[PDB]
C-alpha cells in the first residue's frame, strides 16, 4: 500500500535527513506491506500560499501527516495555524514537532494537531514540583495577558490547589506595558518572598529593570522563571541568581524529526493493519465530506507508546505531550548558566553543582518575611 506524508520545511539539510529518517523507519521497524513516502513543501513568507499549496499538493496527494517546524520568524507564530486549520478541515492528523505555543494547546480548535514537545505551560508543572523540593509555602505569581498566560496561570493554580499550599497573589499585566514598577510594588508589599515570572522577552526585560529599580533584586526575594526569559536580551537587564529552566533536547530538530517519523510510521502501520480504514481525503477540490477516521487515528497516536524512541523513552500523554522529561534547572551564576539540578520525570534532584540564589544569597533562605 502507498501512503504519503507531508513535511513543510524550507531547511534543505533537514529535508534530506527527513527523507533519510523516513527510509530508516521503513527499513528498521518494517514497512513490508505499506509503503510510506515523504514529500516536502517550502516555507513561504505569507500563509495564504501555505493553504493554497497544502491543499493543491499535499491534500491532493492525500497525505496523512505533515511535519511542520516552528516558523522561521518567531513573531508570526500564526503560520503553522493555517496548517492546523487545513488539517482540521478534512480532519487530517498533523504533527508539529518544534511548536510549543499554547494556541494549539486548546484541542477544541486544533484537535488534529499534535506536538512532540511540551508547551511552555508544562513548564509550570516543574515549578510546583520545584517548590515541593524547598517547601516554599509563600509565592508571588507574575503573568502576562495572552493565551499562554491564561493557560499557564490556570495550570499552576489548579496544580497548587490540591496540596493546600496556595499562591499568595497572581498579577496579570498587558504585554508591552511601558512601566510595571507599581505592580511589582504591590507584589513587594505582600508577605511572600518567592517570585514566579512568565512573560515575553520585552516584558521580561521591563520587569527585570523594574525589579532592579527599587531594590527588589536584593536578598530574600527569590526569583524563579522559565525558558523564554533566559533567551533574547532580558539578562542584559536581568540580575544574577535568576533560576530559569531548560527542557531536555527540544532545541534539536533532527532528533525530533527522526522520532516523529518513527512514531508516525509505527502508528500508521499498526492501525492500517487492523480495520477497514477509509482512504485519505482526495483533495482540496471535489471533496464534499470530511475524513472521519481522524479521531480514531488520534486515539491510536495517544495510545502509540513509542517506547523505542531515538532520544529515549518517548510516550505521549492524554493530550499530545511527552511526559517524564529530564528538565534541568538553570541557575544563573555571575552571568553564566549552570546545570545545577536534573529532573528525570519523578523528582527534581539537584546535582553537585552549587546554586547561587538571587541577591547574593549562598544558601537556601526562608520564602517569606513576617510583618
Amino acid at each position, epitope marked *: 500500500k502507498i501512503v504519503n506524508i507531508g513535511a513543510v520545511l*524550507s*531547511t*534543505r539539510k533537514h529535508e534530506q535527513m527527513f527523507r533519510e529518517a523516513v527510509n530508516q523507519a521503513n527499513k528498521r521497524h518494517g514497512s513490508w506491506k505499506i509503503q510510506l513516502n515523504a514529500t516536502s513543501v517550502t516555507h513561504k513568507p505569507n500563509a495564504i500560499q501555505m493553504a493554497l499549496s497544502v491543499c493543491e499538493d499535499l491534500i491532493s496527494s492525500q497525505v496523512y501527516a505533515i511535519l511542520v517546524s516552528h516558523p*522561521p*520568524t*518567531p*513573531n508570526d507564530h500564526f503560520t503553522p495555524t493555517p496548517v492546523s486549520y487545513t488539517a482540521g478541515f478534512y480532519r487530517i492528523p498533523v504533527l508539529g514537532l518544534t511548536t510549543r505555543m499554547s494556541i494549539y494547546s486548546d484541542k477544541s480548535i486544533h484537535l488534529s494537531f499534535l506536538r512532540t514537545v511540551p508547551p511552555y505551560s508544562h513548564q509550570s508543572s516543574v515549578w510546583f514540583e520545584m517548590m515541593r523540593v524547598y517547601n516554599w509555602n509563600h509565592i508571588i505569581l507574575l503573568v502576562s495577558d495572552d493565551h499562554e498566560g491564561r493557560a499557564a496561570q490556570k495550570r499552576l493554580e489548579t496544580l497548587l490547589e490540591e496540596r493546600e499550599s496556595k499562591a499568595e497573589k497572581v498579577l496579570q499585566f498587558d504585554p508591552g506595558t511601558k512601566n510595571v514598577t507599581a505592580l511589582l510594588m504591590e507584589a513587594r508589599e505582600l508577605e511572600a518572598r518567592v517570585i514566579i515570572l512568565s512573560a515575553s522577552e520585552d516584558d521580561a526585560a521591563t520587569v527585570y529593570r523594574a525589579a532592579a529599580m527599587l531594590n527588589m533584586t536584593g536578598s530574600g526575594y527569590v526569583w524563579l522563571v522559565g525558558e523564554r526569559e*533566559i*533567551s*533574547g*536580551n532580558a*539578562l*542584559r537587564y536581568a540580575p544574577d541568581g535568576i533560576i530559569g529552566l531548560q527542557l531536555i533536547n527540544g*532545541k534539536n*530538530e533532527s532528533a525530533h524529526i527522526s522520532d516523529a517519523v518513527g512514531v508516525v510510521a509505527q502508528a500508521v502501520h499498526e492501525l492500517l493493519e487492523k480495520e477497514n480504514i477509509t482512504d485519505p481525503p482526495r483533495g482540496c477540490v471535489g471533496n464534499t465530506n470530511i475524513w472521519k477516521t481522524g479521531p480514531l487515528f488520534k486515539r491510536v497516536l495517544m495510545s502509540s507508546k513509542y517506547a523505542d524512541g531515538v532520544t529515549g523513552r518517548v510516550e505521549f500523554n492524554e493530550d499530545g505531550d511527552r511526559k517524564f522529561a529530564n528538565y534541568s534547572i538553570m541557575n*544563573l551564576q555571575n*552571568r*553564566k*548558566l549552570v546545570q545545577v539540578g536534573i529532573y528525570n520525570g519523578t523528582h527534581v534532584i539537584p546535582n553537585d553543582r552549587k546554586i547561587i540564589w538571587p541577591g547574593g544569597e549562598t544558601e537556601k533562605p526562608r520564602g517569606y518575611q513576617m510583618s
Partner: nanobody
Framework: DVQLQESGPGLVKPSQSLSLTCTVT?????????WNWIRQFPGNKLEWMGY???????GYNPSLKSRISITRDTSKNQFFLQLNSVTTEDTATYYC????????????WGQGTSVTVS
C-alpha cells in the same frame, strides 16, 4: 569547532548597495544568540554596525538608520550586512561575531573582511 567566514565584492562602484557576507559553520547556530556586525577603521576605532536576533530585532548606531540593513537567510546559514553611504574614504575592515546570552562574552569572532573602497 564552530567558526565564521566572510566575503564581499571587494571592488566598489558609485551608487552601490554593498553586501558583506558572513556564514556560520560547524553547527546549526541559526536560532539562538544575537549575530553582530561591526566596522573597524585604519585608526583602530570600532563601533557596532548591527545586532540581529533570530527573530528580526536589528539595532545599531542611529547615524545610518536607513543606510544599514541586515538580510539573514537560514537555508544557507547566511547573513549579509547591506551597507550604503560608502564614499571613497569609507575603506575599513568589518567583522561578524556572535552574542552569547547573559553578555557572557564576545568570544567567537569572525576572521574579518577588509572592505576596500577607492
Amino acid at each position: 569547532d564552530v567558526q565564521l567566514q566572510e566575503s564581499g565584492p571587494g571592488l566598489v562602484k558609485p551608487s552601490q548597495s554593498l553586501s558583506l557576507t558572513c556564514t556560520v559553520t560547524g553547527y546549526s547556530i541559526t536560532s539562538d544568540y544575537a549575530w553582530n556586525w561591526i566596522r573597524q577603521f585604519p585608526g583602530n576605532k570600532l563601533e557596532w554596525m548591527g545586532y540581529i536576533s533570530y527573530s528580526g530585532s536589528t539595532g545599531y548606531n542611529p547615524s545610518l538608520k536607513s543606510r544599514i540593513s541586515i538580510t539573514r537567510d537560514t537555508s544557507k546559514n547566511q547573513f549579509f550586512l547591506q551597507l550604503n553611504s560608502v564614499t571613497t574614504e569609507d575603506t575599513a575592515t568589518y567583522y561578524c561575531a556572535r552574542l552569547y546570552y547573559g553578555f557572557y562574552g564576545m568570544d567567537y569572532w569572525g576572521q574579518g573582511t577588509s572592505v576596500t573602497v577607492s
